[PDB]
Amino acid sequence: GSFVGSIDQGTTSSRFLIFNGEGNPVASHQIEFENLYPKSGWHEQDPYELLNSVQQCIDGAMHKFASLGYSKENIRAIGITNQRETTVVWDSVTGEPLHNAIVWPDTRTSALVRELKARQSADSLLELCGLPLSTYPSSVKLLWLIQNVDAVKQAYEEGRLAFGTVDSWLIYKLNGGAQAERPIHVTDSTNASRTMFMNLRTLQYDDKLLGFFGIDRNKIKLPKIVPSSDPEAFGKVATGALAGVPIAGCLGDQSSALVGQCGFSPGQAKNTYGTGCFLLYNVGTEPVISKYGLLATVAYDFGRGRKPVYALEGSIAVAGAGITFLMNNLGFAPKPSEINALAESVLDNGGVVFVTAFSGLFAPYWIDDAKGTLFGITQHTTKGHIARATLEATCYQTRAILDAMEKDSGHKLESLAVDGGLSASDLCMQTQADISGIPVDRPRMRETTALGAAIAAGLATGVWRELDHVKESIAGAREVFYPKMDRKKAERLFRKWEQAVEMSRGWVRE
Amino acid sequence: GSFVGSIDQGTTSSRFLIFNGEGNPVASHQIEFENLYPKSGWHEQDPYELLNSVQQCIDGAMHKFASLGYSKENIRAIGITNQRETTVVWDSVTGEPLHNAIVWPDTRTSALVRELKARQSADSLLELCGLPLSTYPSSVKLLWLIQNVDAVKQAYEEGRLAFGTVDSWLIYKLNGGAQAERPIHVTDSTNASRTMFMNLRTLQYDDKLLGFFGIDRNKIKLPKIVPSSDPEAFGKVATGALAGVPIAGCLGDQSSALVGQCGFSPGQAKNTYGTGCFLLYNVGTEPVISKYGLLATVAYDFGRGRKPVYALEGSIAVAGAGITFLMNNLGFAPKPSEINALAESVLDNGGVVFVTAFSGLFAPYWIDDAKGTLFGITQHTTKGHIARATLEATCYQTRAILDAMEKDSGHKLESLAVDGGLSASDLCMQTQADISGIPVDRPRMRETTALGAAIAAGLATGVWRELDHVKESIAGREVFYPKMDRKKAERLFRKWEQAVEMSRGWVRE
């Protein structure tokens, strides 16, 4: 038949997958690449490590695709999904990087954020772009680069400086960056919504936003904002095993995950578990500015006359990191599987609640003076109770964020899909269904984020006619966990958690 | 030479030691005996298991003593020290136990305690006897026995019921219970101060106290209250390897530990480490009734015209039990040695504070709605930080109790002596000195509690002439000195008290 490829360029690993018409992979290749931490809190990557990682996964996956009897001519199109915010700067003329890419967790911008928050109009940014000032957005990373690296400052003033998120860099280079007929310098609405340069409501660059950061549109090269699904805006792969294959899809990774879960209606949510959590909440065609510190962002922009769809986003710092803490810091067990086994070994949390505020707590609590705080310990408390409480902590915080999304949105939570990391813990996802009072859907096909980009590319090139056809086609280990806990009991457990959170604030003094 | 024996009858162990004139043991024998836990919170012992364990230690220790070339004729007298409060009832005529002994931690009295506190006149008890109503004192255990066992009620109403703490039971039987010329049913001032039957200031049974519990002086046989050191009041061992050897000393175990530490001056304190802590604070010859829930009790009553000495007492639930918690519950390590090593692995607590209120917190905090609460956890927190915080928790609570004792008594803390259990941890002891700002004295000779009874018996029979002779004779690592800047110690204590305050209100029912 006909297949769709997906480049999934992540924070620590790259991937290329080839999906069939029902969204199941037939060929895959993964590579872990090098992350650089020059100074403390600094996080960098060689942009060519990102591109070459990807090119190696293309070569590997296509080597098997061939063993299956297929070639690039069997690939209708490829989509791209990427770690968001990570900032790349390159020379418009050479097409070469002027500095390393600054990865989204990088904290070098700390001081620069404090100054920008003091500036006039800082209060207006949230309503314009959907995000508040912080170290994460590409805006502060790009401005920091220009202010602290003389190559990129020089480049900026000479008019040769090009900016891009990872999607733009990959698409730019894959088309044969600079030395190419019709060079492709673009970014999709989801990725562009993460810079703080784009008006969330118009999906176009906003001069009041760019003006605040001091970036002149006439002097830097910004990627053209295009839909997440387009038959031509992204061009094609120039050389290699995919030479001549069109790129037709592009989505920020967390948005791509929502698409991979078919979260297309208002109130449909996804949670992706890793070290922490990234939750996205489909809010429909009108953006929602949060009153609870949630981010307003684009879910997907599939064009074809259809309105762009927005989302509310929240994140949790400690999910898998809590299991890691139990395994390494406390030595409970040497494998995460065995941590779950300990949690399953006991019937309940034993009264234990673990407010996993290692670095304080964020949305909807925003408690900066709590640390990790463990309540309910008695002589009868064993490793299993603490393991359970650690899994429960992520479920409570997930509910707290979803509860805020409901209030922000006005849309009742209609469904929750989970992928990655701790979602593999049957106990944890069963606990999530119990606590939130909603079924929890876990796809057996695990590459949800990669599939989102394939869906985007497939829609642009008639692999799928519409979004209803995507759902029906994708829907053709346990997969759905249904609430089994007495509601009165779920509410008591959630109130005990919220009690513990409140009792945790004010620990830290300065 | 002349030696002094000491019977040390404990909650889980019995032992007999023979001390020389310098307070060092030359023969020892220890036996672990059976404790019975019928239901949850119930704790019982066969009174003959205590006596037989003890008698077996006497025989064993005297076999080693003989190999040294000595016999009973070389032992001027023996002393007895015992687990307190543990309540024994036996038949006045036969001398046999009517029920098993109810050990001090037994909580079957909880409902009966609730009723007695609701009663009128309950507010008067503390100032009379020095203790408030709780599950621990023998009074509630005896009253429970009378109300729920018909062998005792009948024995009680028939006029045959004899009551005793473990000291009284042991001395009664060792002299030959019932069928003995001159039978001895006695108890010392320290043990008698623990029942709630005795006026603390007069050292005699109080009709208002006994009346409150409904115990009739003329119907039950109570032990005669005598000094902790007396040449005749305790009689002598009737049979066995010590037949004819006088009993001349008797002290509740925690008082005996203070004596064994030579804590004879006001402001001298001791802490004995086990599963928890028992701290005693010498307050001199006039008792101090606490305003912070500390117990007022008799330190020792050495008679010979001397006036009895009183103490303030406090206890901590989690000391050694905290190490056990790290080892077994959390699997940090398999041996206390290694838990200590982990705590030594780090330079400080890492910001971690462990309010070890597994069963709430007692004096001076009295927080009944807290549980164990661990603060300060980050991704940089390791087993060593938590192990350190666990040792620190006992030091912080030790200081809080000592601080309350100073305020109650008005006597400045002069010294702190430690024995048993966690006192072997140099780090814990050094941290205690750092936090309390006072030297911590740990005797190299380990049987501090047994020595106290030997001192009592030795004083009564001129092995030692005076307390100055006791001190000098025994004095013939050991001290931990504060090495932490007071500024840092006060910050650490303030973080602990912050954590304690942040812990209250956890339990909602």
Numbering used by the authors:
A (entry chain A): 65 to 540, 550 to 583
B (entry chain D): 65 to 540, 551 to 583
Copied sentences from the primary study:
Here, we report the first structure of glycerol kinase from the thermophilic filamentous fungus Chaetomium thermophilum (CtGK). Glycerol kinase (EC 2.7.1.30) catalyzes the transfer of phosphate moiety from ATP to glycerol to form glycerol 3-phosphate (G3P). Overall, the CtGK polypeptide chain can be divided into two distinct domains classified by Pfam as FGGY_N (residues 65–325) and FGGY_C (residues 331–583) connected by a flexible region. A similar case is found in CtGK, which forms extended dimers via the interaction between the C-terminal domains with a prominent contribution from hydrophobic residues (Phe422, Gly436, Phe389, Leu394, Thr437, Phe439, Gly440, Ile441, Thr437, Thr445, Leu438, Ile450, Trp580).
Subsequently, by replacing the cryoprotectant solution with 20–25% glycerol, we were able to solve the enzyme-substrate complex with a clear electron density that could be attributed to the bound glycerol moiety. In total, three different crystal structures were obtained in the presence of glycerol, constituting 13 polypeptide chains. Generally, the same extent of the chain could be modeled as in the apo structures, i.e., for residues 65–583 with an approximate 9aa gap between H18 and B18. The substrate is bound in an evolutionarily conserved cleft within the N-terminal domain that opens towards the C-terminal domain. The glycerol molecule is coordinated by polar interactions with side chains of Glu149, Arg 148, Asp317, Gln318, and additionally with Arg148 main-chain amide. The carbon chain of glycerol packs against hydrophobic Trp168 and Phe342. A similar mode of binding was described previously for P. falciparum GK, where Phe271 and Tyr135 undergo shift upon substrate or cofactor binding. However, the movement of equivalent residues (Phe342 and Tyr200) was not observed in either of the presented CtGK complexes. Of note, we solved and refined five CtGK structures, and each of them belongs to a different space group, despite crystals having grown in the same buffer condition. We observed that in the absence of nucleotide, CtGK adopts open conformation, which upon nucleotide binding closes up.
